[PDB]
Amino acid sequence: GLFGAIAGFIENGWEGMVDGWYGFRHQNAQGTGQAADYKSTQAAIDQITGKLNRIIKKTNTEFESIESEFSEIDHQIGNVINWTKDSITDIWTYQAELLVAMENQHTIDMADSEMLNLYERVRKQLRQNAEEDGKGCFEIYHACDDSCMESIRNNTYDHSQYREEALLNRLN
């Protein structure tokens, strides 16, 4: 897709993640774990909720009947009404198809961009202490316990604390 993350450099989604749309899976000495990102999840959900508020509604225009159900209409006027109604139906059918096709394209790409923005946020956080593996993961070049993993997820990871250790492990 447009931003290259969802159905892109991330190979597939996680069925195990049920408490969020985007999140993290880590690996260290203590073991493995999983956690959802609240901010990126709500950013996507609030944007979809906005679309629904705008699309799921009708006009308040009161329309009356111009065609009798139980008696014959004038033949001339009836043909004009039939031409007009079928023309109006073709416009609305076209507009409905275009609306939903356009919105679905935007919804998919919007969600893709939120995945990329979370990924880019973590990259700049880690700075020179990690390297990209190309699959949406960061190989971290220092000892990174559960509290250190939490600080990456919580956006309080200080790169300068581990920089000296990490640069030596990267150069090797």
């Binding site: 880590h26 139980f70 969600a111 960061f138 190989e139």
Partner: protein
């Protein structure tokens, strides 16, 4: 031996297909319908002062056909017309009929005002017919009067009747022209003289000549506040005893569906009611009220989630 942190997104086992600009078969995590395909086979009349006319046709309310005796006056926000509703007991039709029906179906009520029209002793104003039965006896349109000669064969006298609109709103006045079956019948009821009915006001003028099986054709116009409408006639006029005032605004519905006072609806059609919150609808192009727009589509799924990329 580096540690790892992996970014990722959710997925589901059972995804749903939607259409995009570039792909007909795009799988997403969730979606929702935008086209309503189901209708309630009922007229949802909750919160509506409604009138079910039943066997009464809207035009029958103004002239007073026996079927419309219980609908000669009233108020409403919704007026329901049924199939095979009776407007005319005697043979005939109204000029600009559909225009008149639509005007009644837009109203929010009808009230009646007396014309007070009087006729001399030479005129029998209480003419009746077997075609219009009321209480097991020969009758006539309740808001009109069949004027004929008291003595058979005699000339119907030159008569003048004027109605003034004293109200602050416009009134709807109706009348009929009897077109006799034969020359014998014409001479029996209205005499040998040549017949001519003139109707005139500030905003209206017309002349009618009875064509000589039998039929009473109806005509109508509006009398504005303060204006006078005059009838000049010498036989053939079916004169009004009362005129109508259409009050306010209301929603007209044509349907055979039964009424239900439990559910609410702002959109109606022949088949019933459409209560949906969805923007589009595929039941019928003929709808009334505040409706979702009609589309030639079974379904249009709106995506409410990302691409589903399962494990």
């Amino acid at each position: 031996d580096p540690d790892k942190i992996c970014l990722g997104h959710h997925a589901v086992a059972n995804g749903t297909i939607v259409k995009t600009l570039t792909n007909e078969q795009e799988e997403v995590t969730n979606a929702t319908e935008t086209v309503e395909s189901t209708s309630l086979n009922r007229l949802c009349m909750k919160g509506r002062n409604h009138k079910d006319l039943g066997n009464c046709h809207p035009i029958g309310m103004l002239i007073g056909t026996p079927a419309c005796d219980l609908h000669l006056t009233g108020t409403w926000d919704t007026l329901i017309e049924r199939k095979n509703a009776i407007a005319y007991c005697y043979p005939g039709a109204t000029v600009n009929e559909e225009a008149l029906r639509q005007k009644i179906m837009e109203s929010g009520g009808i009230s009646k005002i007396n014309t007070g029209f009087t006729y001399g002793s030479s005129i029998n104003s209480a003419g009746t017919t077997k075609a219009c039965m009321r209480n097991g006896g020969n009758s006539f349109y309740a808001e009109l009067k069949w004027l004929v000669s008291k003595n058979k064969g005699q000339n119907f006298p030159q008569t003048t009747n004027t109605y003034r609109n004293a109200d602050t709103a416009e009134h709807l006045i109706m009348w009929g022209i009897h077109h006799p079956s034969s020359t014998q019948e014409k001479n029996d009821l209205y005499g040998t003289q040549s017949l001519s009915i003139s109707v005139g006001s500030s905003t209206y003028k017309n002349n009618f000549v009875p064509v000589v099986l039998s039929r009473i054709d109806f005509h109508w116009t509006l009398v504005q506040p303060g204006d006078k409408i005059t009838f000049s006639h010498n036989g053939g006029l079916i004169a009004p005893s009362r005129v109508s005032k259409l009050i306010g605004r209301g929603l007209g519905i044509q349907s055979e569906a039964p009424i239900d006072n439990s559910c609410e609806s702002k959109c109606f059609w022949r088949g019933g009611s459409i209560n949906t919150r969805l923007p589009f609808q595929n039941l019928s192009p003929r709808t009334v009220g505040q409706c979702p727009k009609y589309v030639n589509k079974k379904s249009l799924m709106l995506a409410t989630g990302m691409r589903n990329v399962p494990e």
